Short mmCIF file of C-alpha atoms (C1' of nucleotides) and ligand atoms in Angstrom, two decimals:
data_model
loop_
_atom_site.label_atom_id
_atom_site.label_comp_id
_atom_site.label_asym_id
_atom_site.label_seq_id
_atom_site.Cartn_x
_atom_site.Cartn_y
_atom_site.Cartn_z
CA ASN A 2 0.98 -38.66 25.83
CA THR A 3 2.44 -36.22 23.28
CA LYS A 4 0.09 -33.48 22.06
CA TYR A 5 0.40 -32.73 18.33
CA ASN A 6 0.13 -29.50 16.38
CA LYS A 7 -3.20 -29.14 14.53
CA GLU A 8 -1.62 -28.33 11.16
CA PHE A 9 0.44 -31.50 11.38
CA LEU A 10 -2.63 -33.57 12.27
CA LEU A 11 -4.62 -32.09 9.39
CA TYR A 12 -1.94 -32.91 6.84
CA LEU A 13 -1.25 -36.33 8.36
CA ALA A 14 -4.95 -37.25 8.38
CA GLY A 15 -5.07 -36.61 4.61
CA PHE A 16 -1.88 -38.63 4.05
CA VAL A 17 -3.17 -41.51 6.15
CA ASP A 18 -6.53 -41.45 4.37
CA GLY A 19 -4.41 -41.85 1.18
CA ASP A 20 -1.50 -44.27 1.85
CA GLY A 21 -2.27 -45.44 5.40
CA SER A 22 -4.07 -48.42 6.88
CA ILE A 23 -5.84 -49.02 10.16
CA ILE A 24 -5.73 -52.79 10.65
CA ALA A 25 -7.30 -55.09 13.22
CA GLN A 26 -6.58 -58.83 13.26
CA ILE A 27 -7.55 -61.96 15.20
CA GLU A 28 -4.61 -64.36 15.24
CA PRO A 29 -5.03 -68.04 16.22
CA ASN A 30 -2.66 -69.04 19.00
CA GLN A 31 -3.11 -71.96 21.40
CA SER A 32 -1.26 -70.32 24.27
CA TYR A 33 -3.77 -67.51 24.61
CA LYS A 34 -6.77 -67.90 26.91
CA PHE A 35 -9.31 -67.94 24.11
CA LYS A 36 -6.96 -69.59 21.62
CA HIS A 37 -6.64 -66.25 19.77
CA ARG A 38 -4.98 -62.89 20.22
CA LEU A 39 -6.02 -59.46 18.93
CA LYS A 40 -3.52 -57.37 16.98
CA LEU A 41 -4.08 -53.70 16.16
CA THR A 42 -1.86 -51.86 13.67
CA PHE A 43 -1.56 -48.34 12.29
CA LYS A 44 0.58 -48.50 9.15
CA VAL A 45 1.71 -46.05 6.49
CA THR A 46 3.27 -47.62 3.34
CA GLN A 47 5.64 -45.91 0.85
CA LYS A 48 8.09 -46.91 -1.87
CA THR A 49 11.48 -47.32 -0.18
CA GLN A 50 12.91 -44.49 -2.31
CA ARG A 51 10.77 -42.27 -0.06
CA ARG A 52 11.49 -44.04 3.22
CA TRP A 53 12.93 -40.70 4.39
CA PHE A 54 9.35 -39.49 4.72
CA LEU A 55 8.53 -42.43 6.99
CA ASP A 56 11.71 -41.81 9.06
CA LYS A 57 10.56 -38.20 9.54
CA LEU A 58 7.14 -39.53 10.60
CA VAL A 59 8.82 -41.59 13.33
CA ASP A 60 10.44 -38.41 14.68
CA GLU A 61 7.26 -36.34 14.42
CA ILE A 62 4.90 -38.90 15.93
CA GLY A 63 7.58 -39.77 18.49
CA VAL A 64 6.83 -43.49 18.62
CA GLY A 65 6.76 -46.39 16.11
CA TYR A 66 9.37 -47.55 13.64
CA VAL A 67 10.06 -48.12 9.98
CA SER A 68 10.55 -51.53 8.33
CA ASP A 69 11.88 -51.96 4.81
CA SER A 70 10.54 -54.97 2.92
CA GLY A 71 12.65 -54.28 -0.16
CA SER A 72 10.51 -52.47 -2.71
CA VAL A 73 8.40 -50.66 -0.10
CA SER A 74 8.77 -49.62 3.52
CA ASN A 75 6.12 -49.16 6.24
CA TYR A 76 5.78 -46.94 9.20
CA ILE A 77 4.27 -49.10 11.96
CA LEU A 78 2.61 -48.31 15.30
CA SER A 79 1.18 -51.28 17.26
CA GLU A 80 2.04 -50.63 20.90
CA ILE A 81 -1.40 -50.26 22.48
CA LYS A 82 -1.07 -47.19 24.73
CA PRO A 83 0.78 -44.97 22.23
CA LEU A 84 -1.60 -46.15 19.52
CA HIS A 85 -4.53 -45.08 21.66
CA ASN A 86 -3.08 -41.60 22.25
CA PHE A 87 -2.07 -41.11 18.65
CA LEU A 88 -5.42 -42.18 17.17
CA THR A 89 -7.36 -40.13 19.73
CA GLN A 90 -5.66 -37.06 18.31
CA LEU A 91 -5.75 -38.06 14.66
CA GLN A 92 -9.35 -39.29 14.50
CA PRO A 93 -11.18 -35.91 14.38
CA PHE A 94 -9.40 -35.08 11.13
CA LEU A 95 -9.89 -38.37 9.22
CA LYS A 96 -12.54 -38.64 6.46
CA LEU A 97 -12.04 -42.12 4.96
CA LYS A 98 -10.55 -43.98 7.93
CA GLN A 99 -12.28 -42.25 10.82
CA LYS A 100 -14.67 -45.10 11.60
CA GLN A 101 -11.79 -47.60 11.62
CA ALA A 102 -9.86 -45.34 14.04
CA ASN A 103 -12.82 -45.05 16.40
CA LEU A 104 -13.40 -48.82 16.37
CA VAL A 105 -9.75 -49.35 17.23
CA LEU A 106 -10.14 -46.96 20.16
CA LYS A 107 -13.29 -48.82 21.37
CA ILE A 108 -11.48 -52.14 21.09
CA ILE A 109 -8.50 -50.87 23.04
CA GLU A 110 -10.72 -49.53 25.81
CA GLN A 111 -12.41 -52.95 26.11
CA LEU A 112 -9.23 -55.07 26.08
CA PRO A 113 -8.97 -55.60 29.87
CA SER A 114 -12.60 -56.68 29.92
CA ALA A 115 -12.18 -58.97 26.84
CA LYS A 116 -9.46 -60.92 28.66
CA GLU A 117 -11.91 -62.11 31.33
CA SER A 118 -14.93 -63.26 29.38
CA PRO A 119 -15.39 -65.29 26.21
CA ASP A 120 -18.66 -63.52 25.46
CA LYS A 121 -16.79 -60.23 25.75
CA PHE A 122 -13.83 -61.43 23.66
CA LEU A 123 -16.24 -62.53 20.95
CA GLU A 124 -18.00 -59.17 20.97
CA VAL A 125 -14.69 -57.38 20.55
CA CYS A 126 -13.89 -59.73 17.65
CA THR A 127 -17.10 -58.55 15.92
CA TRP A 128 -15.71 -55.01 16.02
CA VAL A 129 -12.57 -56.35 14.36
CA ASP A 130 -14.91 -57.73 11.64
CA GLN A 131 -16.39 -54.24 11.21
CA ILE A 132 -12.94 -52.68 10.73
CA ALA A 133 -12.11 -55.26 8.05
CA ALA A 134 -15.45 -54.56 6.34
CA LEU A 135 -14.64 -50.83 6.27
CA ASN A 136 -11.18 -51.52 4.79
CA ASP A 137 -10.65 -52.93 1.28
CA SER A 138 -10.21 -56.40 2.77
CA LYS A 139 -9.16 -59.18 0.33
CA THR A 140 -7.00 -61.84 2.12
CA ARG A 141 -8.62 -62.11 5.52
CA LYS A 142 -8.86 -65.60 7.08
CA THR A 143 -9.63 -65.43 10.82
CA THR A 144 -12.94 -63.74 11.75
CA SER A 145 -15.22 -63.59 14.77
CA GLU A 146 -16.93 -66.68 13.36
CA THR A 147 -13.66 -68.67 13.48
CA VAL A 148 -13.45 -67.67 17.14
CA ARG A 149 -17.10 -68.53 17.87
CA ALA A 150 -15.53 -71.99 17.93
CA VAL A 151 -14.99 -71.26 21.60
CA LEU A 152 -18.19 -73.25 21.30
CA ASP A 153 -16.64 -75.94 23.34
CA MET B 1 -11.81 -14.44 -10.46
CA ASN B 2 -9.57 -16.87 -8.62
CA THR B 3 -11.35 -18.88 -5.92
CA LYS B 4 -9.92 -18.52 -2.43
CA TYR B 5 -9.52 -21.87 -0.71
CA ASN B 6 -9.61 -22.46 3.04
CA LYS B 7 -6.59 -23.35 5.16
CA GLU B 8 -7.79 -26.51 6.85
CA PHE B 9 -9.11 -27.89 3.52
CA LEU B 10 -5.76 -27.20 1.80
CA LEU B 11 -3.80 -28.81 4.66
CA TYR B 12 -5.87 -32.02 4.59
CA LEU B 13 -5.97 -32.09 0.79
CA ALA B 14 -2.19 -31.59 0.53
CA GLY B 15 -1.75 -34.76 2.65
CA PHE B 16 -4.30 -36.67 0.59
CA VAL B 17 -2.68 -35.58 -2.70
CA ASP B 18 0.80 -36.54 -1.46
CA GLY B 19 -0.91 -39.92 -0.83
CA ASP B 20 -3.28 -40.80 -3.71
CA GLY B 21 -2.87 -37.78 -6.02
CA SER B 22 -0.73 -37.15 -9.08
CA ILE B 23 0.61 -33.98 -10.69
CA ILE B 24 1.23 -34.81 -14.30
CA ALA B 25 2.76 -32.99 -17.23
CA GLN B 26 2.67 -34.48 -20.74
CA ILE B 27 3.82 -33.66 -24.25
CA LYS B 28 1.25 -35.09 -26.64
CA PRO B 29 2.10 -35.55 -30.30
CA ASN B 30 -0.49 -33.73 -32.38
CA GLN B 31 0.20 -32.66 -35.97
CA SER B 32 -2.33 -29.90 -35.85
CA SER B 33 -0.47 -27.87 -33.22
CA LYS B 34 2.17 -25.28 -33.99
CA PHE B 35 5.17 -27.41 -32.99
CA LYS B 36 3.41 -30.74 -33.62
CA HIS B 37 2.87 -31.29 -29.87
CA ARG B 38 0.45 -30.00 -27.25
CA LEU B 39 1.48 -29.58 -23.61
CA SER B 40 -1.11 -30.98 -21.19
CA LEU B 41 -1.02 -30.35 -17.41
CA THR B 42 -3.14 -32.41 -15.05
CA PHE B 43 -3.87 -32.53 -11.33
CA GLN B 44 -5.46 -35.96 -10.61
CA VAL B 45 -6.79 -37.74 -7.53
CA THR B 46 -7.56 -41.47 -7.89
CA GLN B 47 -9.91 -43.52 -5.73
CA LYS B 48 -11.79 -46.84 -5.85
CA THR B 49 -15.26 -46.05 -7.28
CA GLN B 50 -17.09 -47.15 -4.13
CA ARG B 51 -15.52 -43.95 -2.72
CA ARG B 52 -16.35 -41.74 -5.73
CA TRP B 53 -18.42 -39.54 -3.40
CA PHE B 54 -15.09 -38.25 -1.96
CA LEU B 55 -13.96 -37.22 -5.48
CA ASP B 56 -17.37 -35.71 -6.23
CA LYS B 57 -16.94 -33.53 -3.11
CA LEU B 58 -13.63 -32.28 -4.55
CA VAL B 59 -15.45 -30.95 -7.57
CA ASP B 60 -17.67 -28.99 -5.20
CA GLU B 61 -14.85 -27.75 -2.94
CA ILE B 62 -12.36 -26.88 -5.67
CA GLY B 63 -15.32 -25.66 -7.77
CA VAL B 64 -13.97 -26.81 -11.13
CA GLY B 65 -12.81 -30.13 -12.61
CA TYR B 66 -14.65 -33.38 -13.15
CA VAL B 67 -14.78 -37.05 -12.11
CA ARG B 68 -14.34 -39.94 -14.59
CA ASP B 69 -14.86 -43.69 -13.97
CA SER B 70 -12.46 -46.29 -15.38
CA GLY B 71 -12.63 -50.00 -14.65
CA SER B 72 -12.88 -50.21 -10.85
CA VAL B 73 -11.54 -46.77 -10.01
CA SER B 74 -12.54 -43.14 -10.51
CA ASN B 75 -10.41 -40.00 -10.85
CA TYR B 76 -10.94 -36.36 -10.09
CA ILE B 77 -9.21 -34.43 -12.88
CA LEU B 78 -8.37 -30.74 -13.20
CA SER B 79 -6.58 -29.64 -16.38
CA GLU B 80 -8.06 -26.22 -17.12
CA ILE B 81 -5.02 -23.93 -16.98
CA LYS B 82 -6.12 -20.82 -15.06
CA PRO B 83 -8.02 -22.57 -12.25
CA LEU B 84 -5.27 -25.20 -12.05
CA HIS B 85 -2.69 -22.45 -11.57
CA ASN B 86 -4.80 -20.77 -8.88
CA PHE B 87 -5.39 -24.09 -7.06
CA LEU B 88 -1.77 -25.35 -7.14
CA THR B 89 -0.56 -21.87 -6.01
CA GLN B 90 -2.63 -22.24 -2.86
CA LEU B 91 -1.98 -25.97 -2.34
CA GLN B 92 1.79 -25.92 -2.93
CA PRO B 93 2.86 -24.53 0.48
CA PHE B 94 1.42 -27.58 2.24
CA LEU B 95 2.72 -30.31 -0.09
CA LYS B 96 5.70 -32.42 1.11
CA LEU B 97 6.14 -35.09 -1.60
CA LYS B 98 4.68 -33.37 -4.67
CA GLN B 99 5.68 -29.76 -3.95
CA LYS B 100 8.35 -29.70 -6.63
CA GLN B 101 6.01 -31.08 -9.31
CA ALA B 102 3.41 -28.45 -8.27
CA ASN B 103 5.96 -25.66 -8.62
CA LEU B 104 7.17 -26.91 -11.99
CA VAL B 105 3.56 -27.01 -13.23
CA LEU B 106 3.15 -23.42 -12.07
CA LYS B 107 6.34 -22.37 -13.89
CA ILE B 108 5.25 -24.12 -17.13
CA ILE B 109 1.79 -22.52 -17.04
CA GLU B 110 3.43 -19.10 -16.62
CA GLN B 111 5.59 -19.71 -19.68
CA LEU B 112 2.93 -21.11 -22.04
CA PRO B 113 2.27 -17.78 -23.82
CA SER B 114 5.91 -17.44 -24.82
CA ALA B 115 6.32 -21.18 -25.38
CA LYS B 116 3.89 -20.76 -28.26
CA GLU B 117 6.31 -18.51 -30.16
CA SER B 118 9.79 -20.03 -30.34
CA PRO B 119 10.99 -23.62 -30.96
CA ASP B 120 13.79 -23.19 -28.39
CA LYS B 121 11.48 -21.86 -25.71
CA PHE B 122 9.05 -24.67 -26.43
CA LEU B 123 11.90 -27.17 -26.08
CA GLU B 124 13.03 -25.65 -22.83
CA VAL B 125 9.53 -25.83 -21.38
CA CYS B 126 9.51 -29.49 -22.49
CA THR B 127 12.57 -30.16 -20.38
CA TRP B 128 10.57 -28.90 -17.42
CA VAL B 129 7.98 -31.52 -18.31
CA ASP B 130 10.85 -34.06 -18.25
CA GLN B 131 11.72 -32.93 -14.71
CA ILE B 132 8.18 -33.53 -13.42
CA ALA B 133 8.17 -37.05 -14.91
CA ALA B 134 11.52 -37.71 -13.18
CA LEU B 135 10.11 -36.62 -9.81
CA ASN B 136 7.04 -38.84 -10.34
CA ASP B 137 7.20 -42.69 -10.37
CA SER B 138 7.22 -42.60 -14.19
CA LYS B 139 6.94 -46.02 -15.86
CA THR B 140 4.99 -45.77 -19.17
CA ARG B 141 6.24 -42.46 -20.61
CA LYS B 142 6.79 -42.24 -24.38
CA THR B 143 6.97 -38.64 -25.54
CA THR B 144 9.82 -36.62 -24.07
CA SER B 145 11.63 -33.35 -24.78
CA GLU B 146 13.95 -35.44 -27.01
CA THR B 147 11.01 -36.65 -29.10
CA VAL B 148 10.17 -32.98 -29.62
CA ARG B 149 13.72 -32.09 -30.57
CA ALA B 150 12.58 -33.44 -33.91
CA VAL B 151 11.65 -29.81 -34.50
CA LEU B 152 15.07 -30.42 -36.04
CA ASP B 153 13.20 -31.40 -39.20
"C1'" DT C 1 0.13 -66.21 28.94
"C1'" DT C 2 0.62 -61.84 26.65
"C1'" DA C 3 2.33 -58.07 23.70
"C1'" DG C 4 5.23 -56.39 20.41
"C1'" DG C 5 8.04 -57.44 16.72
"C1'" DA C 6 9.75 -59.95 12.54
"C1'" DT C 7 8.98 -61.50 8.06
"C1'" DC C 8 6.37 -62.42 4.31
"C1'" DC C 9 2.18 -62.85 0.92
"C1'" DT C 10 -1.98 -61.43 -1.80
"C1'" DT C 11 -4.27 -58.49 -4.74
"C1'" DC C 12 -5.38 -54.73 -5.87
"C1'" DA C 13 -6.29 -49.28 -5.91
"C1'" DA C 14 -3.71 -46.36 -7.34
"C1'" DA C 15 -0.53 -43.33 -10.00
"C1'" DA C 16 1.20 -41.97 -14.29
"C1'" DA C 17 1.07 -42.11 -18.40
"C1'" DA C 18 -0.98 -43.14 -23.33
"C1'" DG C 19 -4.60 -41.46 -26.55
"C1'" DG C 20 -8.96 -39.31 -29.11
"C1'" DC C 21 -12.92 -36.13 -30.37
"C1'" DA C 22 -15.46 -32.00 -31.73
"C1'" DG C 23 -16.74 -27.04 -31.03
"C1'" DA C 24 -15.02 -22.30 -31.54
"C1'" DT D 1 -5.18 -24.45 -34.23
"C1'" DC D 2 -6.51 -24.58 -29.63
"C1'" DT D 3 -8.48 -26.39 -25.43
"C1'" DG D 4 -10.99 -28.51 -22.66
"C1'" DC D 5 -13.32 -33.07 -22.10
"C1'" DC D 6 -13.26 -37.81 -22.65
"C1'" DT D 7 -11.44 -42.96 -22.47
"C1'" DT D 8 -7.88 -46.74 -22.12
"C1'" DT D 9 -3.50 -48.97 -20.69
"C1'" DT D 10 0.59 -50.25 -17.96
"C1'" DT D 11 2.80 -51.41 -13.90
"C1'" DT D 12 3.32 -50.90 -9.80
"C1'" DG D 13 3.19 -48.79 -4.72
"C1'" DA D 14 0.40 -49.60 -1.84
"C1'" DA D 15 -2.99 -51.53 1.60
"C1'" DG D 16 -4.46 -55.27 4.19
"C1'" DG D 17 -3.77 -59.07 5.74
"C1'" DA D 18 -1.13 -63.84 7.10
"C1'" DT D 19 2.01 -66.29 10.72
"C1'" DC D 20 6.26 -67.43 13.48
"C1'" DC D 21 9.32 -65.69 17.59
"C1'" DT D 22 10.44 -64.48 22.15
"C1'" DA D 23 11.15 -61.42 26.25
"C1'" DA D 24 8.55 -60.09 29.80
CA1 CA E 1 -5.47 -44.89 -0.99
CA1 CA E 2 -14.81 -53.23 2.31
CA1 CA E 3 0.98 -42.83 -2.65
CA1 CA E 4 11.18 -40.98 -10.51
#
DNA sequence: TTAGGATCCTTCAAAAAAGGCAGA
DNA sequence: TCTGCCTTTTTTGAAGGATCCTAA
């Protein structure tokens, strides 16, 4: 649990509200208890020419990594505990993505509980729906309703 | 007077501008201006129109400028020279990606009065416009300092 | 089984220009 | 002439997913 400087968080919140994404996904997979897994991602995208900015972000946040897809690169943070700490500190300063951040926090806090109960897993999937609705979602496939086929 | 902007607003806004903003300098052909071209300087923030309220708030906070809709997106735009200069002066220290463009815009604005008085000074200021376009992800630019250099006629 | 990572696609939502008009 | 508003176009640079892999 790093603590960040306020001036860094203020600037970063603005940058994330611009070029960032707070992403929650339900991924079908037969080896998981409820035939699906939850994936939570904080991402910041930038033309690879400016990957240096993302590399600096790695250093400054102190966790995560940068992946180059050719034309653009992405800073990525997915590991649950660091993501929780980071978003806890970022969230107060967000204006466009605040609600997404807080839903990701609520999801993370319920994960242990969602592992034990299909009712509970479903409910957490509905919060994933809400995050997608808050985002500019356009290619989504798997939703809580797909899962609700734990009806069975 | 020049509006004084608050620190936490400038810090957040600097991040947001490095994200979705644009600092733009243009040379616009126009036969009714002294050297057949007008310099135009713009600070712009783009956002999908469902989030226009965020751009509308910028008009309130910055206290000048306007919002325009186009297709599915809207833009906050500030091009009025004196307020733009005051705003970018205060924003520039917190910029990380667009700091150089901000500082070039400030330099150009400072030189406008004497740009309007010699071909060679006008040309030089135009090369500063070239430098901003280079720093930006320029892709549709037409009129450059070389276009101007047709003051040669 | 579970979590994190790898690799890629889909579709814009931005960016960064290009222009034009009409009053003072 | 000037300047400050207006209005469109072009081409991405982002966003926001999708899905396979494998060590733990
Ligand atoms: Ca954005
Ligand atoms: Ca939406
Ligand atoms: Ca950007
Ligand atoms: Ca460039």
